[PDB]
C-alpha cells in the first residue's frame with residue numbers, strides 16, 4: 001500500500017521482509033506494519049558507547065563554542081572546548097565504565113552518558129587455559145529428593161552441586177528463577193515471569209528457615225496427619241502440583257514470618273539492610289505480590305494487574321498507596337520472601353565456589369515478562385502492550401509461536417541510556433559464573449506480533465545491537481560472569497560474527513549439527529567458543545528424539561496441522577537418525593558390535609552413552625548434560641507453542657538425587673564422559 005506507511009515502518013525499525021528458516025524471502029503486509037506502528041509509543045546524544053583502547057570521537061551539533069566536562073565513574077574530571085558543527089576526541093585512555101559528559105553554552109547544559117566497554121565478555125581462567133568443561137543443565141522444579149516439599153528447590157540445588165563437583169563437573173545450569181505468581185501458582189512458565197529483577201519464592205527451602213523450626217504453631221501444623229498426607233501426595237506425584245506445593249510453603253512461611261518479625265538481632269538487621277539497599281524495585285515487587293494475593297481472595301481468576309479494579313491498575317494511584325499503608329505486614333512478608341530466596345541462592349553460589357567450580361552456577365535470563373506482572377505494573381511506559389513477542393513460522397514450529405510477552409520499546413531503551421538493560425544484567429549476573437541469554441538474537445531483532453494475532457502476522461523489529469553487546473561485555477567483566485547465547489531458531493547472519501567477536505558462547509545442539517544431507521559435523525569441528533548439548537528443555541530427550549515422540553505428540557497437540565509437512569519431518573528424522581548413527585561409528589563412540597541401521601534400532605544404554613560421548617569428545621569448550629538423558633527418560637518437560645495442551649514445566653525426574661548418584665550406571669556414565677572431557 002502507501003509509501004507513507006512504508007517509510008514510517010522503516011523509520012520505526014520494522015523490517016519489510018526477512019529470510020525464513022527455509023532460506024526463502026518473506027514479505028510483511030501493510031496490515032502488520034500499521035498495527036505495529038500503532039503499538040509503538042541535542043548538541044550531543046544522550047548516550048554514546050565506545051570500545052576501550054580505541055579513539056573516541058564525539059560529534060557536536062549546534063553552533064558557537066561549547067565548554068565540556070567529562071567526569072569519570074571514579075570521579076576524574078577533564079575539561080575542554082569545542083565548536084558546534086565540529087567533532088573532538090574524548091581524553092585518551094578512559095577506563096571502562098559509566099561516565100558523564102556535559103556540554104554548556106550560555107546557561108544551558110546537555111548531558112551525555114558515556115559508556116566505555118571491553119570488546120569481549122568475561123571468560124574464567126579454566127576456559128582461557130583451553131580446558132574442556134562439563135556441567136549439568138537442570139530444570140530445578142523437576143528434582144526429586146528425600147527432603148523437598150514436592151518441588152525441586154534451593155536445598156536440592158545445594159546437594160546436587162556437591163555431587164556434580166565431586167565427579168568433575170564445573171557447573172549446574174538452571175531454568176530462569178525469576179519471580180512468578182505465588183497468588184496464581186499454576187502460571188508456572190519460568191519464561192512468563194512477573195519480573196526479571198526478583199526471584200521465584202517457590203524455590204525457598206523451608207527446612208532451612210530457622211523460624212519455621214522455632215514456631216510452635218508451625219511445628220504443630222507440620223505434624224498434622226493432614227499436612228503430612230498432603231506433602232506425601234505432592235512428593236509422590238510424577239508431575240509438580242504447583243497449587244498444593246505453594247499452599248504448603250506459604251502456609252509454613254507465613255507462620256515462620258510471625259516468629260521472625262519479633263526478632264531484634266543480627267538476622268533482623270540483615271533483612272532490614274537488604275530491604276533498604278534494594279530500594280523501590282524490591283518494594284514494588286512485594287507490593288505487587290501483596291495486592292495480587294488480596295485480589296485472588298476476592299476472585300481467583302484475577303491473573304494480573306489488567307484484571308484488577310481500575311483503581312489498582314495505576315501503580316501510582318492514591319489507593320495503591322493506601323492499600324500498602326493498610327497492609328504493611330503483608331508487604332513485609334513478601335519482602336522477607338525475596339530476602340530468603342536471595343540468601344539461599346547466595347549460599348548455593350558460595351558452596352559452588354568452595355568446591356572450586358570455575359563456573360559454579362549458570363543462570364538463565366528470560367527474553368521477556370508477562371503482560372500483567374509486577375515489571376509492567378511498575379514501568380508501563382517501557383513496554384508495548386499492543387504487541388507480543390514470538391517467533392516466525394519455522395522448521396519444527398511451522399505455525400510460529402506467540403509468547404504473549406510485551407516487548408520493550410527499543411527507542412525508550414536508548415532514550416533511558418540503556419538503564420533498563422543495565423539493571424536487568426546487574427540483577428541476573430549476581431551470585432553466578434555464567435548467564436544464559438535466552439533467544440539472544442533479541443539484541444539485534446525481535447519478532448513482534450500484533451496483540452491477539454497468530455505468529456504468522458508478525459514482523460522483525462530492530463534493537464541497537466552494537467551498544468547492547470558492548471554493555472553486555474562490560475557488565476560481564478564487572479561481574480566475572482560469562483555469557484552464553486541461545487542462538488537457536490531463525491537467526492540473522494548479521495549477528496553471528498558479532499556474538500563471536502563479543503566473546504559470547506554459542507549453543508551447539510547435537511540434533512541440528514548436520515548439513516543439508518544429514519552428514520553430522522565431527523566432534524573436532526565443533527567451535528571452541530560454544531557449549532555442546534544433546535538437547536534442551538525445548539526439545540525432545542534423546543529417547544523422545546529417537547522415537548519421534550515429539551512429532552507424534554506435537555501432532556496430537558495441534559502443532560502440525562499439515563500432513564504433507566508432517567510426513568516430511570518424519571522422513572527427515574529417520575534420515576537424521578541414520579546420519580547420526582554413521583557419525584557415532586565413524587568417530588569411535590560406539591563399538592563395532594552396535595547396529596549400523598537406525599531404523600532397526602531402539603534407544604539402548606549403548607546408544608544413549610554413544611550420543612553423549614560424541615558431544616563430550618567435541619571441541620566445544622563447554623558441555624551441558626541433562627539428567628533426563630542419564631535416566632533414559634522419554635517424556636519432554638516443555639512443548640514450545642503449547643500452554644494448556646500439555647503439562648509444561650511439571651514433569652519430574654524419575655529418580656531422586658540420592659538414588660541417581662548411588663546408581664552404578666549413572667556413576668559410570670559421568671566418569672566416562674568426564675574422562676573424555678579431560679582427554680579432548
Ligand SMILES: C[C@H]1O[C@H](O[C@H]2[C@H](O)[C@@H](O)[C@@H](O[C@H]3[C@H](O)[C@@H](O)[C@H](O)O[C@@H]3CO)O[C@@H]2CO)[C@H](O)[C@@H](O)[C@@H]1N[C@H]1C=C(CO)[C@@H](O[C@H]2O[C@H](CO)[C@@H](O[C@H]3O[C@H](C)[C@@H](N[C@H]4C=C(CO)[C@@H](O)[C@H](O)[C@H]4O)[C@H](O)[C@H]3O)[C@H](O)[C@H]2O)[C@H](O)[C@H]1O
Pocket residue numbers: 189190191192367368370371388391394395396397401402403404405438439440452486487488489490512537538539638639640641642643
Ligand atoms: C522454543 C525456541 O523456539 C525457537 O528456536 C527453536 C525453533 O523454533 C525450532 O524450529 C528449532 O529450530 C531449529 C531447526 O528445527 C533446525 O532445523 C535448524 O537447523 O536449527 C534450528 C535451531 O537453530 O529449534 C529452535 C531451538 O529450540 C526460538 O528461536 C528459541 O529462542 C526458543 N527458545 C527459548 C525462548 C523462550 C521465550 O519465551 C521460551 O519459550 C517458552 O516459554 C513461553 C512463554 O511462557 C511459552 O509460551 C506459551 O505460554 C504463553 C503464556 C502463551 N501465550 C498466551 C498467554 C498470554 C498471557 O499469559 C497472552 O498474552 C498470549 O496472547 C497468549 O497467546 C504462549 O502462547 C505459549 O506458546 C513457550 O511455549 C515455551 O517454549 C523457551 O523455553 C526458551 O528456551
